[PDB]
Every structure is written in structure tokens, then in C-alpha cells.
Amino acid sequence: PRPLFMKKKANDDARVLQTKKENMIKNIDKANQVAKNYENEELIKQCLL
Amino acid sequence: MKLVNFLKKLRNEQVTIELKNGTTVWGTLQSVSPQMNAILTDVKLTLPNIASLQYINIRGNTIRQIILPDSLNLDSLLVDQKQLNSLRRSANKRPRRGL
Amino acid sequence: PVNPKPFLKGLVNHRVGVKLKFNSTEYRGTLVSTDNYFNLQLNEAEEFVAGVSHGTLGEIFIRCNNVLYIREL
Amino acid sequence: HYNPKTKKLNLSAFKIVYIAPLKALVQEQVREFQRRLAFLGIKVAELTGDSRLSRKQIDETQVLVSTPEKWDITTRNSNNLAIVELVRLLIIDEIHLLHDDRGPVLESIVARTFWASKYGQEYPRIIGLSATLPN
Amino acid sequence: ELEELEEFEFKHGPMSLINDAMVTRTPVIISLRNNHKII
Amino acid sequence: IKTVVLVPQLGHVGSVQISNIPDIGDLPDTEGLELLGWIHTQTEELKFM
Amino acid sequence: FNQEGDYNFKYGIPLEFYNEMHRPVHFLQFSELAGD
Amino acid sequence: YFSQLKFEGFALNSDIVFIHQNAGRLLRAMFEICLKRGWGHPTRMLLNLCKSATTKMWPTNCPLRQFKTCPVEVIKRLEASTVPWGDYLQLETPAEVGRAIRSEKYGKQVYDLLKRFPKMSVTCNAQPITRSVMRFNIEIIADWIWDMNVHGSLEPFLLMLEDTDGDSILYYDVLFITPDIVGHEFTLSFTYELKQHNQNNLPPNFFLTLISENWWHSEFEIPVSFNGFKLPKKFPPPTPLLENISISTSELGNDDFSEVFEFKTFNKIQSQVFESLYNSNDSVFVGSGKGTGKTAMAELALLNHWRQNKGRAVYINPSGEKIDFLLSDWNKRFSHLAGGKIINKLGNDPSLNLKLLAKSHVLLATPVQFELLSRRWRQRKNIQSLELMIYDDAHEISQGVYGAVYETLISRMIFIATQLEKKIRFVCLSNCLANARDFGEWAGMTKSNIYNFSPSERIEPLEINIQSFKDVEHISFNFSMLQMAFEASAAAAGNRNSSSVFLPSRKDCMEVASAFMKFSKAIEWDMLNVEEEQIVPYIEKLTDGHLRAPLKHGVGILYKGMASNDERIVKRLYEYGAVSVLLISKDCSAFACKTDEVIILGTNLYDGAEHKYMPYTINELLEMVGLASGMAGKVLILTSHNMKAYYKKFLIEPLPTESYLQYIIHDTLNNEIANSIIQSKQDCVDWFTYSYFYRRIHVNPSYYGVRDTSPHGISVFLSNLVETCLNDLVESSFIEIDDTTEIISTLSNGLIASHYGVSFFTIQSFVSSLSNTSTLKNMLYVLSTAVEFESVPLRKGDRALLVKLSKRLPLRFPEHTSSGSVSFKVFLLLQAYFSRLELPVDFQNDLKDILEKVVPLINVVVDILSANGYLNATTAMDLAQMLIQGVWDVDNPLRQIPHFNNKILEKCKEINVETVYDIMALEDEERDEILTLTDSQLAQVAAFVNNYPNVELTYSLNNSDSLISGVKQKITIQLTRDVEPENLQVTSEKYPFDKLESWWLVLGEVSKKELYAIKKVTLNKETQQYELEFDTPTSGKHNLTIWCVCDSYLDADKELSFEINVK
RNA sequence: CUCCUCAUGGUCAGACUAUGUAGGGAAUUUUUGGAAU
Fold this sequence. Notes:
The structure is cut from a larger assembly and holds one copy of chain A, one copy of chain B, one copy of chain C, two copies of chain D, one copy of chain E and two copies of chain F. Chain A has two helices and no strands.
């Protein structure tokens, strides 16, 4: 009750992930440094703007 | 292998160290350096009339011999470094076993 | 050059005697082997103290550091 | 378990338990036992609570000073039963604790000592120590 | 390779006496520098 | 609907900020999974978006 | 958060909107309440 | 407290001290409770909380805090950096880590500590066993580097199997990752029964999540993929048992066959099959049950075969120890009644088992042996003519790779039947199987011929009592198990019943024996039911150095490797009732001691190779429950909770049978190509049409990973598999494929590999390691690294003792491979074979197994070097000699002669003998002086001397004057033997298995280390000639040295050197 | 535990400092004794 079969029928990315990951970490690192730097203001902010 | 490691195992052990100068030492090993420099506490020391000393550090080369307790398990303490070296050193058909 | 190591290698499998620095002990026996650091192994060893036979020791190991000299007998 | 002639102490034979209700009093007791038992070369260490003894040190030790709760929980566990059998000497300090609601733990421990070990069946020495009490 | 050579040299050298001692569990006598002997 | 895909977002009351369409080709059990749509929560009963 | 930016994805169980992973700022503020 | 807040007002601080001491307790309790309940949302969060009580921190505080050496500034920076933890873990370059953590200092330290943080590449392949039961094969890799200070003793990791939501827990287990497991590819298997609705409609995936009980934020969750997993049909019930007893020994035709069975009336199950069995000649699936005699039914089949004047019979059981017992019972009775028939058991040699295949009417062999012998059916025409086969215990085709070997044999025979148009009667004897009818169908059978019964059909009602205990998964047994076993034994002993307990090892048997004695001494019953003075006369021998004291108190010891006499005494005590209790190790399930009751203590046995305990096969348990029958059959099984549902189902209900060919396909297809039946890939697919595998992949495609279920889908998936196979073979140089359907040819590697039957992977390993200028140590290592040694067991003691043994051994294992791997053990046991150490009886068995494997392997080692044309094959030959004999080449030739020891060797030095050939010239009086010993040993020595020939090496060259470079130059070497052999048997004490002698003729030049020619010869005659067709070397003068080297006997090396000038 | 070597990440113009599945701490200036009497 079983049919016969035919053999003819069958017949860098990781580095990029690690890289984009490194750029994500570094960018978040620069951003975090910016947050640390951010961590009177009305008149000074008016003078800047 | 290195017996000094076997000495390193000997912390908190009460021992009597005979020394090359003939001095007898009795105390609990706090540590032994790899130099076999032995630091001990609660030490009675007899120079060739005992002096009682809180802590004594002995330079390894001066140690003649160290007499260990008879209760110590030498079979267990001797085999370490070989196992550590083995640990440092360390397909279809996988299951010989079935269901 | 004839080095102490080759002379000693040729001395293996021969009856030898070794005078230690103390001179308190000399050992006469067949020279079985010697290692690179020059420790000595003798067989059928005999001990001569003060030039007289103390006794027959047998298979014996001599710490290198004690050896004053070795001579062939 | 220790010969008068041969001065080697037999470590693996006897085991000792001292039931002191409080951690602090356990501590005090332990220093006392160390002071008095130092000449035989005995390890007197605490089994209870902040003591934090593991599976091994119990085997290594000879004299134990425990609080009732932690001793109950140690002897309740099925794997250690060898240690429980090894203990010859069960000391109960302040048996008058039975009045208070921790005392239930002591009587449970007592019941376990008599009734629970019948397969080895050698009953340890039990010493109660208490303030003077009626009945 | 170096480890192998060291173990082998140890085996066929004068060290063979103390190696043979450990394997056979045989007694040996050691003349020491203290003028004491250990059997 | 076999696969819900939860994505980077910052929500507000009645509004939300959402990242791009996800690139999920790498994972298994994705053999041509088409993009059906998206789902969201609200508290107001509307017949329109 | 970046409105257009790349992210890796995986199968798993999603967390609560207010869950410990989503509220890290609160722990530094919580211990910072007593300070040091 | 989680956040580390010490306080000024100390009332709060006192309360928080209380919470400090009891918090991890309470939380841990809640976690365990939820885990018992099987609730997904709470259990993970509770596990995190427990971790937080233990290590005092939050998830949002980085796990670097719990390192003792990690500094404060760094952890502050990471807390404030708002970065996913996975990214930091994925970072590799240390400088790049320092840049990522934005402090250049300490970066290297941080990366070191990361590689000290747990990191797992985890995979899981689920697969259904049947529709209800679902087995998960998990591959758990551990990439982190160990530290005893930081990590501690071991790493407990909780493995959760939870549903697609994460709502409820399906299955859970705690697993210990030891220092040995880290970095190895570690498989973990478990089963789960499904629900009714989840059975009907099934989810896209289940979540498999690993969490550290200690380490923070491990969180490795890999989806367990269900995509088009289609479950099979409802299990069909077995053929019914009608009520008839009336079939008996009177029905059979000739009355000489009625004196056989030592009973008259047959059993209830045998009476059902008897009509199709004894009368007709058709293909019969006899089927089920261990207790109901399958031996008896096989006997009937054999008689039916003889009755028709047929005469060739193949009885195949996988258990080699019960084969021997069955041979002992058959030869004394069956053989003499027909009156001529030769019953034999096959040995390790292909040549010897061939000569037995000729001489003997009936052959008994393991599937591996007879598959290896029958691999060339075209070339051996005796195997084309085999009329009748009994496949005994066909349920063991499920068992590992060996079951796949055994279906390769079955498929090969069926392919032979179809190809040769031969009528071959297959009698398939097996256990209760749910998928049995499909299995018979593929064998050329009919639904009427198939008889499958349920396990409950047996005639001795047997209560299977399974009892589950806690924290047992990581241990062989615990103390509660031991008590309960003792209680059961006491019930049996107080009753008239006799009882037995089974154990993982000899060590475990000893431990349980001492324990039992301690239990007995207190209670009334230590009783042996016999006086204490009777028992010492039986145990006078005292072999098995501890078997005395346990057996003296009424508990016997039984394990493989024992002194046989001593074992037999134990068994006799049991049968006579002297010992009411018997402790049998696992491997001795083949020794069937009928019991009134059976206890099974521990379901977990340790193997080193796996590096964790693994539960027993349900097959082993079956062979372990066949022993006991009553007044009422009683079986106690001491099991875990995780294994309870697996044993409680598959013991009572039939075993679903599957096919493991998909693992061995490389080797199998290699074999087919070597036999050149499969000329092309089309030919191979048509060959895979005969597999029990094929039928199976159709009925249950989800188990084999073929997602498409359909004729086209099957075809595509199968062709994919075979294509992958062919690429491995051409890359490994087993074959070659070229377009003109398509043409495939065989190379020298595939030839030998397929002929000896060594697996593809082993051959590939040999190829990778073996080169020119290789040493004997390297060759021996290469030999030790193989897949054939997977079946050599280790529990922890074998490995530690290997370390202790290594002081005393001639060689030293290569430093860059793993000590725990079975290869190192094989290495040291070969060392202990070369030097005759006094081995523990545990290691003797492992040595025996190794020896059963090695001879083909060492043949492959010498021949592969010949194929690569290196003259160092001499050393391989010497090593092979050493394996056949048991002595080194340089150590002493004298020790080769059987049963020599130091003292006796000295007498040989006394008479100044060097070679063995001088012993042949000796006379009787001198021999008597040398050996004073027993008569059997003297006889074996005499046989050794006789069959060890003094053979002379002579050559005759065609033309010495005309010598042309690069031409095929035929030489005729005349070889002549001292005595013409009666038979070729090789005699060795330390190599128990039988060997036929052979020889290698060798030609090569010493300085270049080039072997020009080699040939193998079996010298039956006294004098022969052999023609080496060998290409000549380059121009000029060429040294050519011919060796005649025996495969068996050392110091037989006969050499003749001659030089020719080639133009 | 300590010093060296090596590797390494960083900083400075070879040196310094943290970490390390690393090697080591018996042949003249130190730790495998010329000490012993």
C-alpha cells in the first residue's frame, strides 16, 4: 500500500549582529553620558534659545 | 604532582613541624604559602622550655618536616592536581540507549 | 668535547663509587642510572665510612646535592 | 567511645547534641564547650539558624549545640538518619519550655527519638536540664 | 609532549626507586641530614 | 492568527509610539508568515479608528 | 526607544506592562530614597 | 531587604532581621508549592524572588553584583547605562567590552567574569512516541568556564516545560550541571503525556525555559517547535485470545519431537499461534510476552523447519549471554533427536563464523555478528540459501543504534527475498507492541498471520507496584527506597515466596548487601531458613572476595564477571531456598533466575559518557519482570515521580516500536554501495523502500522530523537525507559520484570500512588522525577513539580508578582529549591487557567488551595505513599481534606462550632461550622440568606450540634483469609451513573469544617509510604460492624488504631483504 | 598568600595597575641546604 519514491525530487551575519550591537551599546553609552551631564534656568534657557 | 598544594589543603590543621635547626613547632596552620612558608596560630614553640605565640610565620626552606594528624585523609588530599589538570584539558548514532 | 654527562652515560652499567662532600660516606655499586639534574641510582651498593666497609645497602638513591665526586672502580 | 590508655579520641563513634532554646544562648554555650573540651581536640560548632552548617560539617563535627527548631528540622529529614543514629547523647536544656508554645517542638523531638528509630533501635541517653518545677 | 618526556625520564631515572616505592607500597629507609633515619 | 509579535513601543493614554515592521525571518516556525496586521488596546467605545 | 531602529527578536513569554523589568528606574529611585 | 537597606531606627531593622532569616525559607516553600501545582505565571516570578532573597538584589540590578571580585564603580555604571543584559553577554572582544562599559580599566576582568557567568546554547527537538505520549530530546550545551570559589560545588538548573502561554507547567525537573559537563554536548530526554483537548488540537510550540537557582538573569528560553507535528492513529488492540486449550504435544506429526519440551499441554498463548506456526510454512509474527515462552515457540518453529528437510536455521537474539545458555540447552537435546543437526554459536571472527555458517545446520548469533557476516550475500552464496529465520525479541529494534543495526539486517534479508525470488520464512518473536502490525506488514506478512497480544494476556497474574520517591533523580537510590525494599523482602521471606532485588552495579550490590544485613540483625529475621553450619561447605571456594559474608546471612550477590562456580553456588542456594534473597546487577538480567517476587531498586544507572544518571530502558525492566511468577506475581519498582508516568504506562500497555536507522544511515548506505547493489541514487531510494524505517516514517512522520506527510513529501525528505549521506561519503573519500542514470564508485576507505562494518564516524576519525610517521601510542589512541565503545559503562569509580591505575601503565593519554570519555578508559584497559595487572572484576567485563570490538578496528587501522601507503603499518601489525596475544613486542617473546609468569620465564633464561622457535625443538623431559602446572594448561601450551608455524619465506621474481619503472610487477612468493593445520584456531588465555589465524605479506623500503605492497592470506595448506601484483618504484637502486607477519602470534616475523635496479 | 614570566585591557613617554582554565618560584646573589659533629 506504499508508493515508490524518487531521488530526483530533492535535487558574516553573526558579525553584523555583533557590530550593530556594539554600535547600539556605544550610542546608548554616549546618550547615557549626555544624561549624566544634564544631571536661573529660566533666564539662562531664554538666553540660549 | 606538587606536594606544596597538598600543604595548601592543610589550613585549620593542628601539626608539629620539626625544623632544620632542630626547633619543634606545634600549632594550627592558618595558611602555607607556595614557598612552603607556613603561618600558624596558637603555637607552642620549643627551640633546642616552650614559648607561647599567637602567630608564627616560618620560611619554607627552614622546615625540616611537618608531622600531620593520623586522622588526616591522605588518599583524598593527594589526588587533586591531576583532576584540576584534567578539568583544564576539558554526529548521528548518539543514543546507544533507546526509548 | 667530552662532557661529564657523556662520561657518566658511558659509566652507566659499571661498578662505581661516589664520595659525598661529607666524606662520612662513600658508596660503591653498579651505576644503574643518572638523571639530568645528576641524581644517582646505584645497585648492590656498599657503604664505606672512614674507608672501612659499613655494610651492604643494595638499591640506593643518592641526592645530587651531596655528591662530591664519582669515580669508576 | 574513647580509650583511657590510648589517647587518640574516637571521633566517628559518638555524636552529641545540646538543645538550647535561643540562638544567643547557643552561642554562649558553644564558647563554653570549646573552652572546656579543647584538650581532647573536639570540634564544637553550632547547627542552628544563623549558624548555617552544611551537609558535610555535621559529619565532621562531634559536639553539636542546636536550637530546638533547627534540630527538629535536621532530624526530620530522611537522608541524615545515620547522624541521628550516631548521636548517643541528647541534652535538652530548659525542658520547662514545654509550657510555652515552642515546647511542642521539644516533645516532638523526644517522640521522634524514642519511636521513629526502631530499625537500628539503640536508644540514646536523654538528659533534661531545667528550672525547678512541680510534677 | 614536554610533560610526557618529563614523566618518562622520571620513570627510567634514579627516581625509579621512589616511584617503585609508591607503587609497591614497600618500605624504604632514608638517611637524612639531621643524622636521623626514616624507615 | 498563529503568531502575535510584541514590539518596542512607548504608550500614552489614548496614543502609542511603535517601532518598524519586525524582521522575523531568522526564527523557526516561520515559513512564509505573512503580515496580517496589528492589535491594540483602548478605553473608549468607537465604531471607527 | 527608537521609532525607526533595528531589533532582534525571539520567542518567549511577554511581561506585564508594569513589571520589574519594565520599571528599572524605580529601584535606583527606591534605594536612592534612603540614599547611599 | 532585597534592595540592601540598613536602617537607623532599629525596630524596623529587627523585624527585617527576622525577615532575613526566614524569608528565603518561606519564598522557597511557595515556589516549591507552585511547582507541584504546575502553575506557570507564579513559578518563574517566585523563582526570581527566591534568587533575590538568596543573593540580595533585584533583576534590574545587574548579576555582576553577586561576583565577589567585581568592583563597585562598574556595577553602578551598568545599572545606569540602560542596556539589555544579553548584549553585554554577547560581547566577546575584551577591549570592546571595556569600551562598551565606557571605562577602559577593568574591561578584561569583566570579560573574564562574563565567561564565568552561565551561558547556554540550548536546543530541543520534541517528537511523539505515540499519540498520547510525547518525548522531548533536549540538547543542553554549557559554554561558561568553571570556578570553585564563585560557582561552588555544582550548578542546579531548573528545567521548565510549560505551555504556549506560560500559564501552566507541563513537566519540570532539576538538573545538576557539574564541572565535568560544561562545554560538552549534553542530551537530556524526558516524556510527557498530553491532555484530551490538547491531544485533539495541538499548539504551535511549548516553551522550554532554563533558570539558575543561584545565578541571576540566566533566562534561556528556547521554543519547543510544533509545526505540522501530526500525531499517529489511536492504538489498535491486539488479536484476541480465544478459549481453547486443546492443542498439545500429540498434534505434531513425528513422535520423536514430543520428547523435547518436558511437558505435554502447551500454554494459552502458544496454543493460539500453534496452527500458523507448526503446520504451515508462512511468514509468522508470533509476538508477545517475556514469560510466555518465546523460546518454546522458537523451538517449535525450528522443528517445523527441520520437518520439511530444510536444515539452515538462524536464531537471532541481541543478548549474548542468554544466547549461550540457550545453546547449552539446545545442543544436548534438539541436535540428537533429528539425529544429525549441528547447533553452533558464532564467534567474533568473520572467517570462523563463516566456516561455522557452512559446517553448522543451526546458527546462533547476535544481530551485529550475523549482520556483519551476511553483509556480502552476493559473495557468500551460503547466505542466499538460508531458508528459515527466527528473529527473537524484535522489540529491541527500538533499542539505540543496535536496534537500527538489527533492522538493517531484517531489511537486507527481505530485500534478498524479493531480489532472489526466494521463499524465506521469517518468524518474528517479540514483546507486546502497539505498532506491531505495521512491523509485520513490512516483513512480508498478512493480518491473519500476525499475532499481537496485550501484556495482560499472560497466565501468571502479576501485580506491578510502582512507587515514586523524591530527590532520587540525581542518585542511584536513597534510604527510603532501601527501607521499602527491605520491607518487601521481609514480606516475601516471612511468606513462602522467594524474592530478588536488582541493582545498578557490583558496588551498589555490596552497599545494599551490608545495609540489608544491618537491617536484619536487629529484627527477628536474619534467617537463612537453613542452619549456619551448612552454608560454609558450599562457599568453601570464597571466590568473589566479598561474596562470603553477605551470603552467609541469607542475602546473595550476583553480578557479571564473577567466578562462575561461586555464582552457581549462589543460584543453587536460591533454587533450594537456602538464600531467600538475591541481589542481581543490571547486566545479569540475561541470567534468568525464576523468582516468586522481584524488587527493582533504583531506576537510574550512571554512565560516565553521558555524565549523569540515566533511567533504565523499559526493555531492561521487562527482562527484569520476567523472572517473577507465583502465589501471586509480585513486582516492586522503585522509581521517581518523573519516570513514574513513563514506566507505569509502557510496562502495562505495549511498547510503541520505532526505528533509529536515521542515525546509522551513513554506514548502512556505505555498505550497500560497497556491495554494489545500489548502482545509483535511484537504486538507493528503492533500497530504502525496504526499511522498517519507511513504514514508520509514514505512520508517524512527526517523530522523524519530516514535516510534510504525503507520498511526495516522504519522497523529498528521504532523498534529502540520502543526499546528505552521499556528500559525507564523497567528502570522506568512501565513494565518488560522476555524471554520465548517475555513476557511483567505491574507494579503498569505503571498501574496508564497509567490509569490517566499522561505523562511518569512527572511520572518519581514523582518517583525520592517522598520517605517515605515526607512532604506536598514536595508533592506540586512534583505536581508543571510536563510536563502538559507547556500550562500555562507567560509574565514577571506573574513572577515578583509571586515574589511580595510570601510574602503573606503559602509556599516557594525549593531553588534548577528555579523560572522562570512554576512549580514555579503553586506552587504559588495553594497557592493562598488555601488562597483566590484577584488575577489579568490574573492569574485567569492560576489557572483554573492548576486546570484542577491537579486532575489526585494529584490522582497519593497519589496512588504512596500507591504503595510504606508509611502511609504518609494521607497527600497526605489531599492535594487532599484541591485541590477539596480550604481550608487548620488546618486553618479552617468552610471555607469549600461554600461561607464563615471571618465575617460569626465568627457567627459559636458565636454558638461554630467546625466540619461541627454540621451544619447538625442545623435548618432553625439559618441558616437564620447566612447567610444573596443571594438565589443561600444559595442553593449551602444546597446542600453541603445534599450530604456531616455523614458516619459511621465499620469493621467485618473474624477471630480475628487465625492471621497468611504473609497471605492475608480479612476484610469486612461495610460503611453506612446518605442520599442516587440522584447524586454524588461535589459542590465548587473556583473549577469551576464538580467533582463526591469518597472515600478512609485506613489501616496502625502510628508509623512505613507504610500503609498496601487502596482501592477507589464510594458509590452510602446508605450502602455497601467492602473487603480489605491485607497481615498481622509480629508477635506480631500490631496497625491498619482505615481511611475513602473523595477525595473531608475536615474534613470527620472518624477513627477507633484496634490492633491484629499476629503469 | 607572595613574586617572576607570559598573555592581556587600559594609561603615560620601556614603565605602572587590574584580570587570567596560562608557565613557573631543585645547578653560583635568596625557597629545595656545606651541613653535621
